[PDB]
Write a protein that binds this ligand. Structure first.
Ligand SMILES: Nc1ncnc2c1ncn2[C@@H]1O[C@H](COP(=O)(O)OP(=O)(O)OP(=O)(O)O)[C@@H](O)[C@H]1O
Ligand SMILES: Nc1ncnc2c1ncn2[C@@H]1O[C@H](COP(=O)(O)OP(=O)(O)OP(=O)(O)O)[C@@H](O)[C@H]1O
Ligand SMILES: N[C@@H](CC(=O)O)C(=O)O
Ligand SMILES: [Mg+2]
Ligand SMILES: [Mg+2]
Ligand SMILES: [Mg+2]
Ligand SMILES: [Mg+2]
Ligand SMILES: [Mg+2]
Ligand SMILES: [Mg+2]
Lengths: 294, 289
């Protein structure tokens, strides 16, 4: 769209919903003793987002800072681990991400700029995090019924499926979402080096919304051991050079076991207001493959 | 500081205070009916920060985008969309020189940025005073220490600061209460009427310096483009914004941005802003992490 067209849309309802969602979610975490961090947008290191069945293997945008190449944040996952290393115990951030995805990813769920509420908990296990997310989501959906006067899935806990089993039964998480009428978990997905893997099993989880809305949250237990981390990076064809300061911290033995997740704020707003395309809930759309005018 | 030294610092108390500050400030705006917007980091347009350095840039699908200097122009566009009252916790990227490493500058930071349709300068100042007074009282509970009391702050004209103290920084070092500086000639978006600028900076005492800037805004296309031309800026670096102004869609408003890290610094009483950041971003020193 062009500038004047963009500012001509009526998105007041979506923004009012977003405000209520942000109020609810931030209070959820501060009420439970989480510390609230500010984001970083530029770093020598960022989330590789690869390997990942959910991706095409994009490289992060980058810019020079005092002559040094910095990467724009793909996600703050490595920084969350470092925050745990600093003894903050339980942390969250409203983190903007920049992911220059292709036109193939303009499916109504993707934006090339977006924010996730990203959180991490020292010593947590996958079951603990999934239980916390269920509590947050159940509580939010009850609130959403008051806000909108419409009904939302009533489930207090969600069914759990192995990634491999999803592939076999539905073919893809896409079709699975299409068939379900309640949120559900997909677990054990081989992906990035930082998700914990133990004897062929991945200790990770994606929360999928029903009715074709697709993934809304993703997380895992983490790796913390240097030699294990380096082997995974190498096996994936990635370069140790891209993670140098982080691997220095790992080699020193300063990473601690932890688990966490990120929740897409815009994807959640979209679900609650029932928008067909995520661009409808953004004052300034960032459609994959289409450079925005404003 | 290498990577290991950076993460070996003690920062728990500062983050603890920051959490309480963020909880207080976001609740302050939601309580008063403000909409909570999410930030943008890449756009063809951004705050020039001049008259008062060039924006970092990156190509996005073949188009040159600017990293956010500030969301000022986007705030005005949200007013134009009819959102009425808005705020955002907005990260900024400002690649300042090594000279700006003065203890209150970082090349990445967040401001709580807000805007209100139809508001006048004294409306926004009163609102900021209410916020700060309330925060200072809560901080006495959190920290067991005493903070500035003033319910309302002294107002200095910009010229009177220059003549009596030389700069806002020297003024800061000699006050014990927050104070306002008004009528400062700067960027094209602040409203200027009869040689008077309808704008304001909130300055902290004890040498901590500026914590907020804001103003009523220009909304008329002709008035806007004159100030841009006069300043020596390129109209074509603001095209889609000027399209909207020319279309007659900009509305009168006022607002301000408040430096979150600068506030945390004041309340914990840290000598350098880097002490309250988990990952320091010191001007002229590319971060190691
Ligand atoms: N391009 C995007 N646009 C909007 N929201 C997103 C986008 N990418 C991720 N998110 C949201 O934030 C979370 C990000 O974590 P993560 O990087 O692991 O997601 P993802 O694997 O890349 O998602 P997807 O495969 O659907 O593109 C997601 O669960 C989702 O809710
Ligand atoms: N480099 C920075 N580091 C940390 N906080 C900043 C920085 N620049 C601005 N801020 C904070 O956010 C606000 C941003 O608005 P503004 O553009 O008007 O600041 P500024 O005029 O450029 O600040 P200053 O004169 O100290 O350099 C400031 O009032 C301040 O609190
Ligand atoms: N946030 C300021 C602008 C800035 O200082 O970046 C304002 O609202 O005027
Ligand atoms: Mg995914
Ligand atoms: Mg993806
Ligand atoms: Mg994911
Ligand atoms: Mg400045
Ligand atoms: Mg200033
Ligand atoms: Mg200023």
């Amino acid at each position: 769209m062009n500038a004047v067209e963009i500012i001509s849309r009526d998105i007041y309802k979506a923004i009012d919903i977003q405000t209520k969602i942000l109020d609810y979610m931030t209070k959820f975490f501060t009420d439970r003793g989480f510390k609230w961090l500010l984001p970083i947008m530029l770093s020598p290191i960022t989330d590789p987002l690869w390997p990942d069945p959910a991706g095409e293997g994009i490289r992060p945008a980058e810019v020079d800072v005092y002559g040094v190449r910095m990467r724009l944040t793909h996600s703050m996952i490595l920084h969350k681990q470092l925050a745990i290393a600093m003894g903050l115990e339980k942390i969250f951030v409203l983190s903007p991400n920049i992911r220059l995805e292709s036109r193939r990813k303009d499916d109504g769920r993707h934006s090339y700029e977006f924010t996730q509420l990203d959180f991490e908990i020292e010593g947590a296990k996958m079951k603990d995090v999934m239980r916390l997310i269920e509590e947050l989501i159940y509580g939010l959906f009850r609130k959403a019924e008051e806000w909108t006067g419409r009904e939302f899935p009533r489930a207090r806990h969600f069914k759990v499926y192995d990634y491999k089993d999803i592939l076999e039964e539905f073919g893809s998480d896409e079709k699975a979402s299409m068939e379900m009428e309640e949120p559900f978990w997909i677990v054990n997905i081989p992906r990035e080096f930082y998700d914990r893997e133990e004897n062929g099993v991945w200790k990770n989880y994606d929360l999928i919304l029903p009715y074709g809305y697709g993934e809304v949250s993703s997380g895992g237990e983490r790796e913390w051991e240097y030699e294990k981390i380096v082997a995974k990076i190498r096996a994936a064809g990635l370069k140790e050079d891209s993670f140098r300061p982080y691997l220095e911290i790992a080699r020193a033995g300063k990473l601690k076991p932890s688990a966490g997740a990120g929740i897409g704020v815009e994807r959640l707003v979209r679900f609650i207001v029932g928008a067909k395309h995520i661009a409808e809930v953004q004052p300034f759309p960032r459609v994959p493959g289409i450079p925005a005018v404003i």
